[PDB]
Structure formats: C-alpha cells, structure tokens
Amino acid sequence: NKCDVVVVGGGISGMAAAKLLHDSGLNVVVLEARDRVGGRTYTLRNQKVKYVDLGGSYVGPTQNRILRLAKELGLETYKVNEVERLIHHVKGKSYPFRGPFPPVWNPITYLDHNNFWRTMDDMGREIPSDAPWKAPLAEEWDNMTMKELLDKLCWTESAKQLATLFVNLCVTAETHEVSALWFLWYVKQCGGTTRIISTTNGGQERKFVGGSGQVSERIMDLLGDRVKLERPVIYIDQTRENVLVETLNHEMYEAKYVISAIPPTLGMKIHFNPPLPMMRNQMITRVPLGSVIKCIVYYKEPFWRKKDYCGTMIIDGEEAPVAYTLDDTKPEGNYAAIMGFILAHKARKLARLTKEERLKKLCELYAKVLGSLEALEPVHYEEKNWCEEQYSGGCYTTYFPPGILTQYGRVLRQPVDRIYFAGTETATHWSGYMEGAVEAGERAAREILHAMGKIPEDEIWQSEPESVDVPAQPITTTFLERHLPSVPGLLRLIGLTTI
Amino acid sequence: NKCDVVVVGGGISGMAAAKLLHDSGLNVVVLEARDRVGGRTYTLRNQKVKYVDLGGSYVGPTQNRILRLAKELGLETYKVNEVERLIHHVKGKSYPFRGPFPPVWNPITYLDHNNFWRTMDDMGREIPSDAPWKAPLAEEWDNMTMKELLDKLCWTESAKQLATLFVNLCVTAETHEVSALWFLWYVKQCGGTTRIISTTNGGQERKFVGGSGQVSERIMDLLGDRVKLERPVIYIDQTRENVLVETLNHEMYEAKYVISAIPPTLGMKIHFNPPLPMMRNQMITRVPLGSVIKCIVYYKEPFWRKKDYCGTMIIDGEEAPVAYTLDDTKPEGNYAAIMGFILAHKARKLARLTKEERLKKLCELYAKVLGSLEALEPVHYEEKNWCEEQYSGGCYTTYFPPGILTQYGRVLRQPVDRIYFAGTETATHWSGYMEGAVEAGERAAREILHAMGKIPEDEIWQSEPESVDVPAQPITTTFLERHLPSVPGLLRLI
C-alpha cells in the first residue's frame, strides 16, 4: 500500500501510464473501480459470438500509439469490411455509393456540400490541437452551438441533414448540445473530416483480433497484483508529505504522485483535501459524456455482401433507431453481424424498450435499408447502453457545451499539486479514442518522471513513429474541390455579373 | 446509527425537511459535509460588519414559505434601501431613474426594450411551472441558447446589452451558456420579469435581521445532536431491507428512507449501490451551477444617500467588474456598505487577483458610478467566491445548458427507490432561492410521510398562506406597454 504512483482508473490510459512507470523501474498501483480493467473498452466473450467489442473497437491510420502498444502486447488487427458498396438511406430510400461522402448531383447542392466539409476543415486549421482556446475567433466560435454553425453554413437542407448525422455519430450528442469551437477542434485533432469519418484510410479501418479489451487485460497480466479491482477511489488528501488515496472498500494507499486516468467529470466522485482550485472544481461539473447504445445483430450469413453491400449504412430520419452501421463479421467470414449505434437523444428515447423490442426495431430497419427480408432473421443479439455506467458516465467521450472550452479548457490537464491528469479527454491527437488514451497516459507518466528528476522537460511530450503495418495515405483534395465557390459565393458572383 | 430518515445536506432545504419530519415525530439525522450548516447561505459575524450575508440574503413578496419558516424561528426582516434614485451606468455615464427598468427615450429603442420584457413574460405563460418540458414549444426553445433568443428578439444593441445584464444577474451565467426554455421557465416561476428584478415588491425587497444563516443555525439548534457536521456522504446502498448511508469519516447510518438535499450535480460525489438509473446517472453530469463573487465594501456613512442615490447601480460594459449593486447598510443606518456581484465570466477572470486588488477595482468603479471620491475610502471589505466551494459547486443555483431540460428535467425530482429529492433546484416556485429550498424540503419530507401511509397523496404538495408582514402587491402593465408594436411589428406597417 506504499508505492511511487497511484493510477486511478484501469482503462487503456491508466494501464498505459502504469506500464510506462513500471517499465521505468517505479512501484505503481492501479486502483480500478470495476471488477475488470478496460473501462470504455469491453470485450464480451460467449459461445454465440466468440468475442465482441461492446465499447471502443476501431483503430486506423495515424493512430500510431495504440497500434504500437497493441503490437508490443502481441495483438493483431484486421480490416473492417468495405469491399462492397456503402448505402446512404435518406427520405425512406437507399442509394448505394463509394467514397468518403455520398455523391451529390444537383450542382447547387454539390457546391453547398463541398463548401461545408471544406469550411469545417478550414476553420479547424485555425485551432491549435494543444490549445483550442487560442484560436483567433475562439470566443465567437465557442459561444455558438454546432446547430447555429450548420444553420449559418448550410444553404441546403441536404447538407444540414448530413452534417447533423456527422456530428451525432462523431460525438454521440446533438448539434444544439455542443460548442462549435470544441466540435471543430475535435474533428481537426482527428485529422479532419475525411479522416474521422472514413473506414478505409480513416478512424474505422481496423479492429483487433479477439477484441480491444485485450489491451488493458494484457497490461494487467504484465503488472500482476499491482492492479486492484473493485477499488473505487473516494478521497485524495495532499495535505501531508505523501499523498493518501482512499478507496470505497476501506483501503488506504500512500504515494509520491497520483495520475487521475478517469473521465474528467468522474473526478466529482472523489472528495479532495484540500479542495480543488476554483477552475477545476467548476470544470468537472461542466463536461458531460455523450449517449450511445452499441448494438450487434447476428445472422447466419453476411447476406448483404451478396447484394453488393458492405454493411455500412448511413441512415437519416427521426424514425430510424440506428443512424450508422458497419459490418462486424469476423475476419474468417463467420459470426456474421451488423454493428449499429443508437445515438444521442435516441439512446435516451429507446432505452425504455426491452432488448427484444430494440432487436425488432433494428431488424425492421435493416430489412428496409438493405431491401432484404433476410434481415428479419437474426440468430443472436448483443448490446450495451453506455449511458447506464456509473464509472464511465456515457460514451464515446466528453463533450463541451457552449462557452466551456474557452473558460475552463486550460485546466483540463493542469496538475493539481501532485495529481497529474491522463485519460483520453486530455489528449491532443485523437482525444476521445483509444489512441488519445495512450497519448495521455504516457504523457502524464512522463510528467511524473520529469517531476522526479528522471527525464528532462523536453521528453514529456514524445512523437510516435508511424506504424509500418498501418501506413496512412494523405488526405488530398482537387483543384475544383479547393476553389469552387460556396452558395453565397456563387450568389455574390451572379450579383456582380448582373453589373 | 439507526433512524427513520437520513437527510443528506444541512442547507435550508435539508433543514426544512428534517424539521418537518422531526415535528411529525420521526427520528431524523442530518448528515452535513461542512463544519457548518446553511450551505449556499453563510452569515459571517465580526465587529467590523456586525453580521453580513456572504451567500443568499434577500427575501420578498410571494416567498411565503421561507417568510413563515423564518418567522417561526424568531427572525424579522427589514427593507433593503430603495428610497432614493437608482442608477443605470452605460457607456461611461450615470443616468439616475426609478422603476423596474431604466427609461429609454429613442422611440425605436423604446419599442425594442418594451417588446423584449413583454415577450419574455408572454413566452413564460406557455411554460408549466411544474413541467417546463411540457411547454408547447419545449424542444424548439430548449435547443436554443438565451444568446440566440436575444439575437432573434432584440433589434437594438441597447436592448440586447440590458437583456444580457438581466440574464447574467438572475442566473450568474452567460447568455450563450443557458437554454432559452430553462431561462424562460426560471423567470416565470419567480413571477415574471418585474417580480424577479425588483427590490420594492420583488425578490430583493428584504433581508433578515442578523443574517439568513440563522434559518439553518436555528433549525440545527432545535434538532441538537441529530445534525452531524463534517459528515460528507460517500455511499448509499439500497440493496437491503433498510438504506445504508456511509460518510467519509467512516460512519454508517441506517434508515428507512433518505432525502437528498444537495445541488443535483453534487450527487456525483456519492457512489450508489445499485447504480442509479440511466437517466439520473447522466443528468447529474449535465447540470452545472453558475459563477459569482459576492463583494461587500463598507464605508463610514451611506454617502450616496446625500446625493439622492439609493445605492442600486446597474453597470454595463466589459471593463466594470461588478454589474449590479444594492445598498447593504444595516437598518439602523450604520455599517454603511454596498453589496455588488462579480458575475459569470468575470468571476472566473477576476478570481486571479488578490482581495485588495479586487477592493481597489470596486472602489474606483463605484467612485465613477456614484460620482463621489468618498467611494475611494473603504473602511472594511468582505467577499466570497462561490466558485471555490467543493460542496456547493457555485452560486446561486444550477443552470441547464441547451437541450438538457427537455431530455432530463423529468428526472430531477423522481424518487430512486427510497431516496427522495429536495434542494431548491427541485422547487416549482422560486427554485434557485431560499423560498424554493423550503418548498422542496417540505414536499420531499411529505412524499416520505405519504410513502409511510401517514398522510394522503393530496397532502404531498401544500399551498402557503400569504405572509402578513410582507404582502404582495399586483404587478401591472400600462395600455401602451401591452399594445405598442415591436420593431419588426412597426416595419410590417411600412
């Protein structure tokens, strides 16, 4: 119970921090509230599915830290199926396509859609990844919701509806719930609009064979009995020489430093002595997590592939319970399955139903989208509503409502005496993901090595070599994508020519 | 150890709940985190100020529960001074006035201001006090911020600036931080724009002689050793026959029911077994409290009165640290003082200064606005930054960002097995105030009495006779206020 560092939380970020500190020769303890490690990742194993990721699952190019960590732990990836055509279902009909966005044929609509994605990335380039409150128009952008920004930018309903689906799927929240500054930061710090939304060459390209929960489980194996499960932390006292960390089951740990590797608002579950400084005290009441039910419907065969659909469906409309799906069949071609997300207000609205009722609605939806009666014949179903988790608060990650990132964002990873902050939310590249978890856990561990005098300051932040297994292709645009006007730019050109 | 009901929190709402249950003959225990009672009320006593409310202070007409409770405990009120002129300071100049809003002379700006207040109250009449998510346009109004609503309604910058001040002072938050539905509900459930903003015949009319902390202290006097200080609740377990409530100092209490009388989000500091239901688990991460420093500058005399000013100042503009003040002099004309609030982002901005640096900024601001060098000679200063408080989370109260009240509002006062929810945030009239704390603590206590079969369902919510000491006068409007067109109304006649 005496150690160098207590890590509070045994998700990927606390496990990555604990491993680094252990590898450097320090004595670490990880206090995990649950009876398992992995946190917002959770790999269920049973005979009907073999294994299935019910939390975080996908990785992709440019996520080099999780790929390197997982590789070193003996894990392998495989590519999510994107051989056959994607489907965009809009106004009750399905339109097959290939590429990052469904094709738009109407020239006016085309300009508006082109301008929308272009402008999201243009604004993102004004926003520093490590300091979004330093953007030149940070206040103006943080004081409006994403809804207000789509209202201003989108001169077509078509573009506004697609943009809405994009926000809801990327951050499991509604356009009117989230700040425009924070959402534009969140997309740019993932590499931009194409990279975040893509399967091939993007965030959803791959999964781990056997499930992502193995990352945290295999580090727990390396650490032995240093991971204490069912130890929720209730109290941290920094008034004396060594920090004292108390758990709910009545144990006391003493350490030189602590890393908090839990979602920022879950800091509220810990009583602090002395009290936190004013800005962190209020920050942790201002930063909710989003809302999602991850649902996986199993079938005898991946029947959609025979119709030349890959299983990816972008599904618009209020009545659809799931707005986005991917094929979740095993790489061997068996345990055929569709993964779908029930997003944001729908996660709250449909949580009232039973599991069997949600399975029925999802099969009825997929049968219509795929024009396939076979979708009404599931062989098994698994789901997880992350809104119910006391020790997560939601999924995938924390969002910032209007006005909060500029006022309180500076303190998200600011140390509090001998407490340092990990967790994906404090990352600067793919924050909200497993990648951001590794970045933040290793960065917080190195802050402590630096505090101890073990490494110089310039080693706190460390670049990551690009994976040789999952290389990234650049995201490119065409001259016409770059230079074609927006709708109001065209109207300005028309008004001028009319003169 | 064992009792009928454990009340978590010894603010006014927890105290009022515990007193009601105690008076009905149950065994109650109050578990208070701090080494004091009163919560968001705090009355400091020293020789320089005699006493000063550093937290909640004001009561007024229509707040009959807090007036009845305090009168039963032996307290008296006095009137906040409003005899002389009020000041609106705009663009670096003071304009003295009387009445609920500063006069506007430009005919366009007049229409724009008149329509703004009128439209806030018109909207409020469609929002049920006890279920604002049932307003006919609930979703539409909940999905916009107040800044977006003000941008829509205000055709002049003058109106928009005064509306901004009004939102910042009522709910200690910025217009772009809050939902329009929730803000409109908040004003309506205090009786509308005139009643919430007014001193005479409104929410700021009176203060308690000796301080409002005396309400919580005097109920603690009654309950004696039933109130346990420095007992932060850390864990609530309802998986067994009786509810088990555990504190940080390693004590265990067992009860038939619990009342949670703490700000909603501070339910995060309690680990629940079984876990909370999904909607409350997320709700209590979505409901922050506002930000405010309350500052009281003392002087040898209430010198502003010689100049026919009462000490109320509405001060616009970014550079002013304090946007609103009231005279805090004691009823006897002594301990002269001005109370001012540093609101919302300015509480965040100015909290980095020292106490003496804040005093200097305040005094230079008041010298400009009162047009008196006497404001530069303070004799004493007290202040409290509520943003620092672990066991409040901010002041005055909890605000709802866009989208949260329609999605989660129904859960605020929904019982969770044998836990019932008090706290001013759960009230239906003057929620956010000491009056809403009494209403909610007494109603939560009565839900428990009904669960015990002690009273019928219809006695859970109880009306309150009007105070004889602080009666309400009607809020009226003129024919012109009712019927003058808005700016886009006047343009639909051109």
Ligand SMILES: *Cc1cc2c(cc1C)nc1c(=O)[nH]c(=O)nc-1n2C[C@H](O)[C@H](O)[C@H](O)COP(=O)(O)OP(=O)(O)OC[C@H]1O[C@@H](n2cnc3c(N)ncnc32)[C@H](O)[C@@H]1O
């Ligand atoms: C839930 C989810 C997440 C998700 C996703 C789909 C869903 C449904 N899709 C993802 C994807 O495909 N690819 C990806 O990279 N990420 C995706 N996510 C997000 C991902 O799961 C999270 O970003 C990442 O797992 C976060 O890791 P981090 O280590 O930062 O945080 P955590 O997993 O929440 O771990 C925190 C641990 O702390 C324990 N805890 C909480 N409170 C306490 C206290 N008081 N004491 C001790 N331990 C505590 C939690 O139990 C948890 O284990």
Ligand SMILES: *Cc1cc2c(cc1C)nc1c(=O)[nH]c(=O)nc-1n2C[C@H](O)[C@H](O)[C@H](O)COP(=O)(O)OP(=O)(O)OC[C@H]1O[C@@H](n2cnc3c(N)ncnc32)[C@H](O)[C@@H]1O
């Ligand atoms: C801070 C403030 C508030 C205020 C105001 C000015 C300021 C600066 N102006 C007011 C005014 O003039 N007139 C008025 O009526 N109200 C005004 N307010 C708000 C008013 O103070 C609040 O509405 C009222 O005091 C709220 O009472 P309530 O009883 O609902 O809430 P509380 O005071 O916060 O008490 C909660 C108690 O719970 C204890 N606590 C917190 N967590 C725990 C745990 N885990 N375990 C045990 N106890 C806990 C708190 O310490 C507190 O005592």
Ligand SMILES: CCCCCCCCCCCC[N+](C)(C)CCCS(=O)(=O)O
């Ligand atoms: C005789 C000429 C009359 C034509 C007047 C043109 C009216 C233009 C209003 C269309 C609003 C379009 N959206 C995208 C909703 C908002 C744009 C925001 S921004 O205006 O670009 O800032």
Ligand SMILES: c1ccc2oc(-c3ncc[nH]3)cc2c1
């Ligand atoms: C809005 C909402 C969901 C979306 O998914 C894609 C996508 N998936 C794979 C390639 N592009 C694009 C897209 C746009």
Ligand SMILES: c1ccc2oc(-c3ncc[nH]3)cc2c1
């Ligand atoms: C906006 C912001 C603060 C304000 O204070 C008043 C007021 N005080 C007492 C009578 N009216 C009116 C008013 C309007």
Ligand SMILES: O=C1Nc2ccccc2C1=O
């Ligand atoms: O699982 C997912 N997480 C995501 C984040 C952004 C966009 C798509 C997805 C997924 O499909």
Ligand SMILES: O=C1Nc2ccccc2C1=O
């Ligand atoms: O203390 C105050 N609380 C208030 C709430 C609304 C309007 C004015 C005030 C005050 O002056």
